[PDB]
Design a protein around this ligand. Structure first.
Ligand SMILES: *[C@@H]1O[C@H](CO)[C@@H](O[C@@H]2O[C@H](CO)[C@@H](O)[C@H](O)[C@H]2NC(C)=O)[C@H](O)[C@H]1NC(C)=O
Ligand SMILES: *[C@@H]1O[C@H](CO)[C@@H](O[C@@H]2O[C@H](CO)[C@@H](O)[C@H](O)[C@H]2NC(C)=O)[C@H](O)[C@H]1NC(C)=O
Ligand SMILES: *[C@@H]1O[C@H](CO)[C@@H](O[C@@H]2O[C@H](CO)[C@@H](O)[C@H](O)[C@H]2NC(C)=O)[C@H](O)[C@H]1NC(C)=O
Ligand SMILES: *[C@@H]1O[C@H](CO)[C@@H](O[C@@H]2O[C@H](CO)[C@@H](O)[C@H](O)[C@H]2NC(C)=O)[C@H](O)[C@H]1NC(C)=O
Ligand SMILES: *[C@@H]1O[C@H](CO)[C@@H](O[C@@H]2O[C@H](CO)[C@@H](O)[C@H](O)[C@H]2NC(C)=O)[C@H](O)[C@H]1NC(C)=O
Ligand SMILES: *[C@@H]1O[C@H](CO)[C@@H](O[C@@H]2O[C@H](CO)[C@@H](O)[C@H](O)[C@H]2NC(C)=O)[C@H](O)[C@H]1NC(C)=O
Ligand SMILES: *[C@@H]1O[C@H](CO)[C@@H](O)[C@H](O)[C@H]1NC(C)=O
Ligand SMILES: *[C@@H]1O[C@H](CO)[C@@H](O)[C@H](O)[C@H]1NC(C)=O
Ligand SMILES: *[C@@H]1O[C@H](CO)[C@@H](O)[C@H](O)[C@H]1NC(C)=O
Ligand SMILES: *[C@@H]1O[C@H](CO)[C@@H](O)[C@H](O)[C@H]1NC(C)=O
Ligand SMILES: *[C@@H]1O[C@H](CO)[C@@H](O)[C@H](O)[C@H]1NC(C)=O
Lengths: 71, 409, 182
């Protein structure tokens, strides 16, 4: 926390830098918080991985001025 | 007979800075003997670390509760025609380097050494959610409340045009669709004028964003007070452990170290208690803000003076530094007119109570008008129900009614 | 465990200080123990007060939720559960309460073509409850929450003004129940 790895699988973030966890470009629903939009999780062999948060499921709503949808 | 559409801005704090306070570095750094005496002094450090960890967890949960409320992230359409509305002030602008709106770009610019505090065992943990994630959540909420209305708050999002949603909100507050569908351009112009006026008020007056600035100033003052209390002598011979170690031997400095801890740990406990009280106040404010978000952003509330002063229609959430900003769009009527009214009328021996509204007259003829708008309509049997006779009703007046079946005969 | 700490004294128990030290010089040790044991007691009372205030706020929220979801139906969104809440089941829990919120979540959406208003002969017919939707051929009056196809009549539509200022008007006919009588 607050200590760069230069002064000390290596990745750095806003809170600091961490070792032992790799970086994954794909973003899932994380469990263990890390800080500043980063998370940590145990996924597949099995190892601790780090990735950015998924904001949510993507769903684009087609807006029209003359159409409606009723259940 | 008329109305004035105004936008009311409400500022509510959501979270604060997460601060983690070291024990050994704050109390007495680079001192093994002082650390030895400190451990004997007890296990206060574990309790303080647990308290600050719980405070940070509570603030994190508060941020996730207030902001992360939707399961899916919605996207605005590229071309925007919301019935001739100027929504570009609240929509994200791709031309800006950040995804925040120009209103938000004015909002983050109105809210304001760290190395000295960082050296003496005081560290500020960064917030878990960055500003980009909060801006994306705000954009998703705006897209949900604009392109789908309040249907996305309950369950799945159902697309609906913005004038049709506005007519739904008018029917919710009791206003017929005639006012909207006959004065749509006037309503749009009034909304644009209110948006421009509130933007000019936010630009000219910097005192509107006061609560977040007060919280930041209180946190900075508490940190400065903690630093100056570290600078206090606490009745010893010196305020630094290095001078006591250089002058006194350890056995003679035992009493001075004890006198320093008795008072330094007390200042730590006082700071922790003040932080806990401030965290409880922030938690109450964040619960109120989350309730306001869920009951004004995700739907329409009939409660008076909860979603802004006046007849509330909709609220636009805005991202703020360590807080949230609500843009309450309210319906304020104007241009009053005196009238002569009666509570009921009876045509032929039987009273005709109106279903909605009351009977008003301009002096010669009686008409049926709504509660909030002056729409003169002829008295018929469709909007009036018959019950009893006009023998016990106080203030009755004799008048005739129009029967639609009469011209048929 | 804080009772087990020495707190700057030579022992963590008063019996050892009483046995070893005579009372006059052990006055300082007893005073040093009290200054710190009373402080730990005050810290415990303060933490208990903060926890009791948080529990009181949570209990007030739970009582409000019980009174406005169990004793009645609330129109407030996301207060009595996510979705269109109907009625909730109170339940007993150890040092707490459990709410079983029964909500109404619609599904199986279907696209449709809609118009803000329909005028038959020079006069607009705005609907009272529900909106005009069309599957491609004919227009029908269905409510907001459910798709119930009904023929457009004069009972669910009120006449007000003309269709000269309404944006997006469409020309269609209406059913008059008095017409088959003639
Ligand atoms: C609604 O209002 C926005 C103001 O934010 C309009 O955007 C401006 O439009 C004027 C004239 O159309 C341009 O001269 C400006 O350059 C636009 N602003 C920016 C930042 O580019 C928007 O056009 C309006 N929508 C309309 C009129 O349909
Ligand atoms: C109801 O109020 C609106 C706005 O307060 C009035 O609209 C104004 O009308 C004047 C007269 O032509 C114009 O000069 C202004 O530019 C209009 N303002 C806006 C924002 O549209 C409207 O006339 C009022 N209606 C009645 C019946 O009094
Ligand atoms: C009250 O309003 C009614 C409705 O507009 C007025 O009745 C009209 O009056 C004008 C002027 O004499 C006539 O040309 C219309 O034929 C009347 N219409 C109906 C349906 O009767 C009435 O005059 C108004 N009274 C006052 C005192 O202003
Ligand atoms: C409305 O009309 C009724 C009937 O024409 C009026 O009732 C009459 O009132 C007078 C005055 O005391 C009595 O002498 C009659 O016996 C009443 N007739 C009946 C059938 O009740 C009534 O007063 C009128 N009200 C107003 C406000 O003009
Ligand atoms: C739109 O819905 C209407 C009513 O549900 C459909 O009209 C029906 O069509 C069937 C097919 O021949 C007839 O048997 C019924 O008698 C019709 N009912 C009425 C009231 O006209 C219409 O076909 C539908 N259109 C589309 C494109 O699906
Ligand atoms: C509904 O029908 C009316 C009547 O035919 C249409 O009004 C005509 O519109 C055209 C085009 O602007 C004019 O040239 C005629 O003079 C209008 N006639 C009358 C009697 O007003 C109206 O446009 C139709 N609406 C739709 C949506 O089709
Ligand atoms: C660590 O140092 C490198 C080199 O300048 C820098 O790019 C990086 O941002 C630093 N990380 C932190 C957490 O300060
Ligand atoms: C109606 O008349 C009263 C006088 O009795 C006056 O005080 C009031 O202002 C009038 N209402 C309006 C809207 O002018
Ligand atoms: C209103 O009150 C006055 C004063 O008591 C009374 O004279 C008058 O008859 C009342 N009007 C009605 C319609 O009751
Ligand atoms: C309705 O059509 C739009 C495209 O215009 C589409 O995005 C949407 O998913 C459709 N909804 C349903 C329920 O078919
Ligand atoms: C919907 O918007 C498009 C784009 O401006 C426009 O061409 C079309 O006429 C609009 N439809 C209605 C019914 O207003």
């Amino acid at each position: 926390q607050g200590v760069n790895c230069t002064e000390v699988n290596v990745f750095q973030t806003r809170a600091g830098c961490l070792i032992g966890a790799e970086y994954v470009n794909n973003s899932y629903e994380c469990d263990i918080p890390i800080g500043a939009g980063i998370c940590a999780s145990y996924q597949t062999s099995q190892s601790i991985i780090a990735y950015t948060m998924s904001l949510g499921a993507e769903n684009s709503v087609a807006y029209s001025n003359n159409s409606i949808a009723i259940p | 007979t008329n109305f004035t559409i105004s936008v009311t801005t409400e500022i509510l704090p959501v979270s604060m800075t997460k601060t983690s306070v070291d024990c050994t570095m704050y109390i007495c750094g680079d001192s093994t003997e002082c650390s030895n005496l400190l451990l004997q002094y007890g296990s206060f450090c574990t309790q303080l670390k647990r308290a600050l960890t719980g405070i940070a967890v509570e603030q994190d949960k508060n941020t996730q509760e207030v902001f992360a409320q939707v399961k899916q992230i919605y996207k605005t359409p590229p071309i925007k025609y919301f019935g001739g509305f100027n929504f570009s002030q609240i929509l994200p602008d791709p031309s800006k380097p950040s995804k925040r709106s120009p209103i938000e770009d004015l909002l983050f610019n109105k809210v304001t050494l760290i190395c000295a505090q960082k050296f003496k065992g005081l560290t500020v943990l960064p917030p878990l959610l960055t500003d980009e994630m909060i801006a994306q959540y705000t954009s998703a909420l705006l897209a949900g409340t604009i392109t789908s209305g309040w249907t996305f708050g309950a369950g799945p999002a159902l697309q609906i045009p913005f004038p049709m949603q506005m007519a739904y909100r008018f029917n919710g507050i009791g206003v017929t669709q005639n006012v909207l569908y006959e004065n749509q351009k006037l309503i749009a112009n009034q909304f644009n004028s209110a948006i421009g006026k509130i933007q000019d008020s936010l630009s000219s007056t910097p005192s509107a964003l006061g609560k977040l600035q007060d919280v930041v100033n209180h946190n900075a003052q508490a940190l400065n007070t903690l630093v100056k209390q570290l600078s206090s002598k606490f009745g010893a011979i010196s305020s630094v452990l290095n001078d006591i170690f250089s002058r006194l031997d350890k056995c003679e400095a035992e009493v001075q170290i004890d006198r320093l801890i008795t008072g330094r740990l007390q200042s730590l406990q006082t700071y922790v208690t003040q932080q806990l009280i401030r965290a409880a106040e922030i938690r109450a404010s964040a619960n109120l803000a989350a309730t306001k978000m869920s009951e004004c952003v995700l739907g329409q509330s009939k409660r008076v003076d909860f979603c802004g002063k006046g007849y509330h229609l909709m609220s636009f959430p805005q991202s703020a530094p360590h807080g949230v900003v609500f843009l309450h769009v309210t319906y304020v009527p104007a241009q009053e007119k005196n009238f002569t009214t009666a509570p009921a009328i009876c045509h032929d021996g039987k009273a005709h109570f109106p279903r909605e509204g009351v009977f008003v007259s301009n002096g010669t003829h009686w008409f049926v008008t709504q509660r909030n708008f002056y729409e003169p309509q002829i008295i018929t049997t469709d909007n009036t129900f018959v019950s009893g006779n006009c023998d016990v009703v106080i203030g009755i007046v004799n008048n005739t009614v129009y029967d639609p079946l009469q011209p048929e005969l």
